[PDB]
Design a protein around this ligand. Structure first.
Ligand SMILES: *[C@@H]1O[C@H](CO)[C@@H](O)[C@H](O)[C@H]1NC(C)=O
Lengths: 441, 49
């Protein structure tokens, strides 16, 4: 039997309801969200890492001029320094005093550590939203099955079909361009491929971790060898990857609104408390029981014992429940001003049962629907003493939950005072007009 | 669970209270003063005999 509703996107707060079917006793439904994953569709653009300036062995020609030949290599530099008299352990490397040439070449590669640490540049557009859901209904225990939040995909949770309806808000913590480094995610407007400056980020960009293009812009200049020494000096801008690592401000794991937790197989934003989720469950007909086989509850009288609008279940009430037959039967408080802790109560022929509830109102005035009949509960509630707690609120405020009787009466006396004064003035104006009209006429 | 109060300085008269904690049954509290000593800091000036 279908049951449509709308529930908040909060994780851990169970949505409770009473599925009422004409002719059958209600069944208590409890749908809770274990987690909700916004899983975007990524497209890798490139990979950034530290560079390695490969410096091959210089070519020393003794009495010749050998010349550069451009090779297809990232940031390849070849220079032909002339007038080199190399000295080495044997001593006198080349004969000709001045007509000696050294060809030094250098080119940038991926560092060996690029396969372990690297930044993946990603373009994110939009993705599936998935969530794990816990449902209970009647005597059926928890089922805890994973669903797709699109509003069209049934999910067979036990023997119930849940069509979890799309998120009201299309908000996603990621912008178009992100950078993934290790377990951190950054909302970085990375340079496009082949644009990276010399030392900021993307100075070394590779499409994949095993690519061969390896665009690299490092400003590598070969320098003249020192007199005597056969070495290949060069000057280069320090890696922009490390500059990024020690200037990168704050990941999205910390910045993220709504308490999104960013995970990185596959790249997702978890437990984000934004908007509402339509739901449509189809409880099987075997769960329902005929209304004739269920207790009928009369003479309901509810008294609120000590209550306080704490985030936890800070309210206790007792209901006297003189009944017809004995057995288990559900309770639910539809108003949304109080959240009932317990799902069922076991009833004897007569007596009383106690239930806990959570609320934000100073005066919680809520209807508790037991079994079939309903009872109205009202009372007074005290402030919680604890300032900061480690658990989220189990209820919702409603912008009237704090007004309280005294402030209600005060604002009433104020509004009524102003209204009465103005209406007294207007009736006075009418009375003068009428008396003057009677004066002449 | 904290409970603040003010009690008389009488010795032997028990101060009684009901410590009430929201959500929990009240607890009876009985604080009694066996004795109260005002102990000044003395410094010997001299001795006479
Ligand atoms: C909800 O399902 C989870 C598994 O996702 C399970 O561990 C838990 O027991 C269920 N809820 C309750 C109240 O048992």
């Amino acid at each position: 039997y279908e049951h449509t509703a709308v529930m908040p996107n909060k994780v851990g707060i169970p949505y409770k309801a009473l599925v009422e079917r004409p002719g059958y006793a209600p069944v208590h439904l409890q749908i809770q969200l274990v987690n909700t994953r916004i899983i975007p569709s990524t497209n890798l653009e490139y990979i950034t890492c530290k560079y390695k300036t490969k410096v091959p062995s210089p070519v020393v020609k003794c009495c010749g001029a050998t010349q550069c030949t451009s090779k297809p290599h990232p940031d390849y530099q070849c220079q032909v320094f002339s007038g080199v008299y190399p000295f080495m352990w044997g001593g006198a490397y080349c004969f000709c005093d001045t007509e000696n040439t050294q060809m030094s070449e250098a080119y940038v590669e991926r560092s060996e550590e690029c396969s372990i640490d690297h930044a993946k540049a990603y373009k994110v557009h939009t993705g599936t939203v998935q969530a794990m859901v816990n449902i209970t209904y009647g005597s059926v225990s928890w089922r805890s099955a994973d669903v797709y939040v699109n509003g069209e995909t049934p999910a067979k949770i036990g023997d119930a079909k849940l069509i979890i309806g799309p998120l009201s808000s299309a908000w996603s913590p990621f912008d178009n361009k992100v950078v993934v480094y290790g377990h951190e995610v950054y909302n970085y407007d990375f340079p496009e491929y082949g644009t990276g400056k010399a030392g900021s980020f993307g100075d070394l960009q590779s499409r994949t971790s095993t690519s061969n293009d390896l665009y690299a812009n490092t400003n590598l200049k070969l320098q003249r060898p020192q007199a005597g020494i056969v070495h290949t000096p060069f000057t280069q801008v320090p890696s922009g990857f490390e500059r990024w690592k020690k200037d990168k401000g704050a990941p999205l794991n910390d910045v993220a609104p709504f308490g999104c937790s960013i995970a990185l197989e596959p790249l997702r934003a978890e437990n984000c408390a934004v908007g509402s989720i339509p739901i449509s469950i189809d409880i099987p007909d075997a769960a329902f029981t005929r209304i004739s086989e269920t207790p009928t509850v009369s003479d309901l009288e509810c008294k609120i014992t000590e209550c306080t609008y704490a985030f936890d279940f800070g309210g206790i009430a007792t209901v006297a429940y003189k009944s017809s037959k004995a057995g288990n039967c559900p309770i639910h408080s539809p108003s949304g001003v109080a959240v009932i802790k317990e799902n069922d109560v076991t009833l004897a022929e007569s007596g009383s049962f106690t239930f806990h509830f959570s609320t934000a109102n100073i005066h919680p005035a809520f209807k508790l629907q037991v079994c079939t009949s309903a009872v109205t509960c009202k009372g007074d509630c005290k402030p919680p003493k604890d300032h900061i707690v480690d658990y989220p609120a189990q209820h919702t405020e409603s912008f009237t939950s704090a007004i309280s009787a005294t402030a209600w009466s005060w604002i009433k006396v104020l509004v009524g005072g102003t209204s009465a004064f103005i209406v007294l003035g207007l009736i006075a104006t009418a009375v003068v007009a009428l008396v003057l009209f009677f004066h002449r006429h």
